[PDB]
RNA sequence: GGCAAAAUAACCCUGUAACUUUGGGAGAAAGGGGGCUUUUAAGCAACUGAAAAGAGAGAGUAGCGACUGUUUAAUAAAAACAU
RNA sequence: UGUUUACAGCUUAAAGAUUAUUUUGUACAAUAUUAGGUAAUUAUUUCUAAAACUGUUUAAUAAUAUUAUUUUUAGUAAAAUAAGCCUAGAUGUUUAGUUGAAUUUAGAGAUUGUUCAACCACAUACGGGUAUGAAAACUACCCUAUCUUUUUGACAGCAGUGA
RNA sequence: AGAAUUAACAAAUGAGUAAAUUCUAGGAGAAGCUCUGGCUAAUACAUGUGCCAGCAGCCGCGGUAAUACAUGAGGAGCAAGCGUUACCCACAUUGACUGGGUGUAUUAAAUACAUAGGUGAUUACAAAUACUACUUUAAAAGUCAAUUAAAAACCUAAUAUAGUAGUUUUUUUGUAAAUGAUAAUUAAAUAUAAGGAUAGGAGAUUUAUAGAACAACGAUUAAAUGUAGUUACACUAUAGAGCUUGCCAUAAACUAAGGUGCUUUCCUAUAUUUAAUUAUAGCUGAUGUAUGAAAGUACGGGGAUCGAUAAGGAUUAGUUUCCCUAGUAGUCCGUACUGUAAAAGAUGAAUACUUCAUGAAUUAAAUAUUCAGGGAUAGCUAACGCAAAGUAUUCUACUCGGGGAGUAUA
RNA sequence: AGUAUCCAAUCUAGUAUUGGUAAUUUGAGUGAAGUUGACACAAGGUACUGGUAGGGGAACCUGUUGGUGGAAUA
C-alpha cells in the first residue's frame, strides 16, 4: 500500500482517499441520482465533491429532504451506502451548508436535529440549574 | 572479522589465539594477540632450501617520470600505481632488448674481425 | 565451489582456484609414459616373470594394457609411498592422489567429448571432493601435505575460512541484543 | 533570406550526449595552456604573446535521396543521372 | 615600604572528586525495479613539526670487545616500499529522531516513539568562520544568501494574532 | 445546595490550595442517549406507503398482509455520557518461538552439485554451563501481584549479563597408547531401456534403372478436385539415399530433472554384498556454477516421411472451421544462442522405526535380505485418499482474501 | 598592513537521475432487462487446456510437445 504509511501496510484501507484523517471538508460541484444493484431498486440521491486536497469524490444523501446545490460546503463522514457502487463514503448533517432533516423528532443525532424548546425542561447547572 | 597487530610476524592461519583490546595504533587495527590457544605447524623446514638489469631498471623509472609528470600530474594515487605496475612489464620486454643487443654486436665484430 | 571470495558471499566475477601449478598437467603425464615403457601390471614384478617368456611378458606388459589398468600400477605406486599403516586403502592422503589420477583422465575425455553433459558436472564435484580432503589432510598431517603435493604437481593455497569450523571451535563468545 | 561582412582558426593537455548498422557520431560540445627569474618560489609578471603572418564557427530538428561520384562548355550541380 | 589566623576578594602549585573531549564490541527499517565500491585508499618503515636541556650510574635488550639502542600525539599543504582494505546485504536509493517507554495483551508479541525525563541535533538558510573560557552559540560577534522593516529584525521562550 | 474555621508546604515572610472539621436549611433539588427483524436483551400492536419514498455495522428489508421505511403508543439497555467515523491491539493458530499449513482449497520456485551459515555418532576423562539458593550491573518517572484484611505509598520480582556455593536427576566444547554408526577408498563379484564417442548390422518408406505392350489407379460416410492414357499405379530383380531402431515389454528397469531402449569396444557415471583400510571428513543449503522437452532464431548442410501458413476440391451450408487432393517453412545432423510449460509424484532433501494379504528376484555350508503397486487396514486427513501424505528429530524456502494481474512501468 | 595559496553562497551551461503537467491516444474494472453470434462446463456436439509458431469479423481455428482439471470402447 502507497497511500497507507503507518501501522498495519498490509491493510487496505477502508477511506482511501479521505484517507488516515476521520473527516475532511469539501465543495459540492453537481447533485446527482445512482441506481442500485440488480435485488434492490430505487433511486437514492448523491453529491459530488471536490475536496480541500483536490480530489474527486462522490457522496451520499441520508435525509429525506435537503438543501443540496451547486457551491455548497460539506463535511464527509466516511461510511457509506452499500447498495450502491462507489459510495463508500458518506456527508454528515448539522454542519456548514446541510439542514437538519425536517419534521423529524426521532434520531436527532444522525441528522442534526437540536432538542426541541418542549422536552427539556431545566437548564444547565452553569446558569439557573 | 578483524584485523590484529603482531610484533613478532610469529603467527600463521591455524593459530588458534585470544586477542585483547588496545587503542588504535592505526585504522581497523584496535585488536593485538595475547596468547596461542593452540598451535598449527610451520613451513620453515621447506622455506630454507627456497644484476645488469638494474642499469636497465633504473632508466626505465626515468623514462616514465619525464613522460608521465608532463602529461598527467598527481592528480589520483590510482593513476600513480596502476601506471607503474602496468607500465614495467611494458618497459622491461623492452629493456630486456635492449640488453637482448649487447650479445648480437659484440659477437659481430668477432666474426667480422677474426676470419 | 571454492572460489576467491574474502567475504561470505561468492560472486560471478570471482574466479576459481588452481588445481594445478603452471604446466603441472605436462609434467605428469610425461611420467606415465616413462611408466608405460618399462613397467609391468599391478600384481605382477619383473623378478616374478624372468623365468618365463616375452610372449608373456608382452601380454602382461602395460603398454597394451587399458587406461583403467594404467591407474591401477599407479594408485599402488602411491600406496606405497603415502601410507600410515600396511595394507592401508582409505586414508586421505591415498584419497587425494585418486582423484588426480582421474583428473588426468576426465579432462582427456571431456576436451575431446565436449557434450557428455554428465561428465561436465562431475569434474566440479571431483575437485570439490579433492578440495576438502585437500584440506582435511592439512589439518591433521601437514608434513604429508607438502610430501603429496609436490608429487603430484599441486599449489599450496591454504583455505580462506582457516580451517575455523572443524579445528576446536567452542565457547563461541558472549554479546547482548537491546533495542 | 543574417546573402555579404565579422568571428572561429595550427599544436599539446583535460573532457566529451541522445541516437546507432557497434564502424561511428566526434576535431562533438564545454574549458585550459604557451613568458622571465632564481629558487623550485602557497615567487615575479604592469594593455596586447604558438608575440607579427598562416590553418574549423558550433549546436537542435524535419523533407528527398542510401553513401564517394557524374551532368545541361556559355544563366539551372540539384531531390535528376549512375551505382 | 602597618598587619593576608581580623573579614572579603585575587594569584600559584599538589592531592583528590566531578565534568568535557578522544576509543572499541554487539544491538540498530525496507529495498538488489542498485552490486562492485575505496585511491594517502589498507599495512609497515621513514621524514618533518610540537612536547625542557645535558650528564652520571644502574637495569634490560641484540651480538658480545662491550659499545650502541630504549617515548607520545599530529600532518600526504611529506615521501618511499609492498599491494591491500570493506563487500558475512560495502556502496547507492527511499523512509525515519533513538531510548526509557505509551496503547493493547493470559503470556510471548505486535503498532506507535505525543505528554515528562536522558542523550544527539537544529535556532530564517542541510551554509562559511572567529574571539573568550574548564565547557559555547542557544537572543554573542563577522560574512554570504532568503524574507521582512528600518539599516533594526527572523517568537521551533511564555502569553497572543493570522494562515 | 449554602455558610464558616483550622492545620501543613516558612515554629521570622505565602501566590494559591485540605481527597481535613464543624454549623443551618431541607429531605434526590443531576439526566440524557441509543434500540426495538436475526447476530442482540426488547411488539408477530395500530396507520399510511407500495421494489416508490427510505433504512442498512454484516445478512438483508419494501411488489397491498411491512414486529425491519415514516407516524403513534408501549417496551429494553447503557448512563454523564450514548451514538457515528478514522487508525492501532486483543478475540485469531489473521502471520505461527509459545503456535499453523503446503497431494487436490489460485501455497515447495524445473532440477542437482555447492559457498557463507545452521546442524549433528559411541564410550571413558577433564572443564564449563544449565537447574536450585544467594549475590553485581541495567537513571528516576511509569508499570509491577506492595499487606498485619490498611489508597493518595518508597512491591525487587521477572528478563538479560558477570560472579560464588552445592555436582546430584541436563546439555554443550574438546582431548584420548581409544572404540568405530554414517560418507568415502581399495581388492573381488554382480547389475544398469543412465550419458557421449568409434565401428558395423537391420527395418519399412521413397526415388531411379531394367523387364512386361495391362488401362485405369488413389482418395472418400459417399463424392469431387487430382495422377496416367506411349506402363502411370502394381509385381519381380539390382543399386543408392534420408529417417528409424521390430518380437524381446513388464508395476517390481536406470539416472538429479528434462528424458532414455538394436549389437561390439574404450571412456564417464550410479547402485548392491563381503573382507580390509581411514575414522565424522557427514546431513542440509541463499549468493553462485552447471544442466534444461518441444516449438522458434542465425549460418552451413541435408531434404524421404509427416505437415502450420496460403491455394484448390467439396460438402453441409447461407460466412470462418472440422473432412479430401497437392504440399512450402519446419520436421533430421553439426556450431551457438534462446532458458520458458499442467517443468507433475501438482507431494522440498536426509536419517531411524512401523501392518496383513498377494506377488517380483537373488540363491546362501563365506555372506542373508531387497523390491512392487494392481488389494486392504492401523494411524493421520475437511472428505476423496496415502504404507507414506504415518510416529520422531535437523536445516532451507513460500504463504497477510479475490478481481486488477504474471499484466503496466523501469 | 599586504602579496600568493585553500574554501562558501549566488549565477551560467550541458549531462546523469528522479518527480510534476499536456494536445492526442489507449487499457481496465463496474453498472443496466441492449445487438450480433454460440466459444465454454455433458464426449457441449470436432475431448478441454498448458508452452510455442502461424493465421484471424469477435468469442476463436490449425500444426508441434506435454498434462488430465474428459467421456467412451471388454
Ligand atoms: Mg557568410
Ligand atoms: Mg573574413
Ligand atoms: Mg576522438
Ligand atoms: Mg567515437
Ligand atoms: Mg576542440
Ligand atoms: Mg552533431
Ligand atoms: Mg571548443
Ligand atoms: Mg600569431
Ligand atoms: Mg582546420
Ligand atoms: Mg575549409
Ligand atoms: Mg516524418
Ligand atoms: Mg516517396
Ligand atoms: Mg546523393
Ligand atoms: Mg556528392
Ligand atoms: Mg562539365
Ligand atoms: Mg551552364
Ligand atoms: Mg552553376
Ligand atoms: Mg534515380
Ligand atoms: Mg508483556
Ligand atoms: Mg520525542
Ligand atoms: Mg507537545
Ligand atoms: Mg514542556
Ligand atoms: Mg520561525
Ligand atoms: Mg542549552
Ligand atoms: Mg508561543
Ligand atoms: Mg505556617
Ligand atoms: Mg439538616
Ligand atoms: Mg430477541
Ligand atoms: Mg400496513
Ligand atoms: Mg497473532
Ligand atoms: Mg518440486
Ligand atoms: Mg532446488
Ligand atoms: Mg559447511
Ligand atoms: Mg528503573
Ligand atoms: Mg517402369
Ligand atoms: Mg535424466
Ligand atoms: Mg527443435
Ligand atoms: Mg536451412
Ligand atoms: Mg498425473
Ligand atoms: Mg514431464
Ligand atoms: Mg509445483
Ligand atoms: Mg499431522
Ligand atoms: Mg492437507
Ligand atoms: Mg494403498
Ligand atoms: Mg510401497
Ligand atoms: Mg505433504
Ligand atoms: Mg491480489
Ligand atoms: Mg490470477
Ligand atoms: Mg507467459
Ligand atoms: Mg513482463
Ligand atoms: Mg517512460
Ligand atoms: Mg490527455
Ligand atoms: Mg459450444
Ligand atoms: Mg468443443
Ligand atoms: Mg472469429
Ligand atoms: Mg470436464
Same mark, same amino acid.
Given at each position: 500500500c502507497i497511500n497507507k504509511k503507518k501501522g498495519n501496510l498490509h491493510r487496505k484501507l477502508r477511506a482511501r482517499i479521505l484517507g488516515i484523517n476521520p473527516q475532511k471538508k469539501g465543495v459540492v460541484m453537481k447533485a446527482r441520482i445512482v441506481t442500485p444493484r440488480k435485488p434492490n431498486s430505487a433511486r437514492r440521491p448523491v453529491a459530488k465533491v471536490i475536496l480541500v486536497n483536490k480530489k474527486r469524490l462522490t457522496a451520499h444523501i441520508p435525509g429525506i429532504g435537503h438543501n443540496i446545490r451547486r457551491h455548497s460546503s460539506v463535511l464527509v463522514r466516511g461510511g457509506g451506502c452499500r447498495?450502491?457502487?462507489?459510495?463508500?463514503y458518506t456527508c454528515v448533517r448539522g454542519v456548514y451548508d446541510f439542514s437538519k432533516v425536517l419534521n423529524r423528532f426521532n434520531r436527532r443525532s444522525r441528522y442534526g436535529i437540536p432538542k426541541p424548546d418542549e422536552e427539556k425542561k431545566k437548564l444547565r447547572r452553569k446558569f439557573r440549574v | 572479522k578483524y584485523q590484529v597487530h603482531d610484533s613478532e610476524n610469529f603467527c600463521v592461519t591455524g593459530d588458534k589465539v585470544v586477542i585483547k583490546s588496545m587503542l588504535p595504533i592505526s585504522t581497523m587495527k584496535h585488536y593485538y594477540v595475547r596468547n596461542i590457544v593452540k598451535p598449527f605447524p610451520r613451513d620453515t623446514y621447506y622455506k630454507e632450501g627456497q644484476e645488469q638489469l638494474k642499469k636497465e631498471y633504473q632508466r626505465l623509472y626515468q623514462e616514465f617520470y619525464e613522460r608521465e609528470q608532463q602529461r598527467?600530474?598527481?592528480?589520483?594515487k590510482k593513476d600513480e600505481v596502476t601506471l607503474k605496475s602496468a607500465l614495467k612489464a611494458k618497459a622491461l620486454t623492452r629493456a630486456m632488448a635492449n640488453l637482448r643487443k649487447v650479445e648480437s654486436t659484440q659477437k659481430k665484430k668477432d666474426k667480422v674481425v677474426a676470419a | 565451489l571454492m572460489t576467491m571470495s574474502k567475504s561470505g558471499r561468492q560472486f560471478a566475477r570471482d574466479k576459481p582456484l588452481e588445481? *594445478?601449478?603452471?604446466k603441472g598437467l605436462e609434467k605428469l603425464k610425461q611420467k606415465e609414459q616413462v611408466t608405460i615403457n618399462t613397467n609391468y601390471k599391478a600384481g605382477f614384478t619383473s623378478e616374478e616373470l624372468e623365468p618365463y617368456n616375452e610372449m608373456v611378458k608382452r601380454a602382461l606388459?602395460?603398454?597394451?594394457?587399458?587406461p583403467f589398468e594404467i591407474t591401477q600400477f599407479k594408485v599402488q605406486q602411491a600406496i606405497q609411498k603415502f601410507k600410515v599403516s600396511p595394507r592401508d586403502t582409505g586414508s586421505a592422503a591415498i584419497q587425494v592422489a585418486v582423484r588426480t589420477e582421474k583428473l588426468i583422465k576426465m579432462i582427456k575425455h571431456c576436451q575431446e567429448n565436449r557434450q557428455d553433459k554428465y561428465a561436465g558436472r562431475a569434474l566440479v564435484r571431483l575437485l570439490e571432493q579433492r578440495r576438502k580432503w585437500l584440506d582435511y589432510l592439512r589439518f591433521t598431517d601437514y608434513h604429508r601435505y607438502k610430501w603429496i603435493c609436490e608429487e603430484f604437481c599441486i599449489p599450496d593455497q591454504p583455505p580462506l575460512n582457516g580451517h575455523?569450523?572443524?579445528? *576446536?571451535?567452542?565457547?563461541?563468545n558472549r554479546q547482548v541484543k537491546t533495542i
Open positions: 447498495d450502491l457502487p462507489g459510495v463508500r | 598527467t600530474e598527481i592528480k589520483n | 588445481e *594445478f601449478i603452471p606388459k602395460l603398454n597394451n594394457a587399458s575455523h569450523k572443524a579445528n *576446536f571451535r567452542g565457547e563461541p
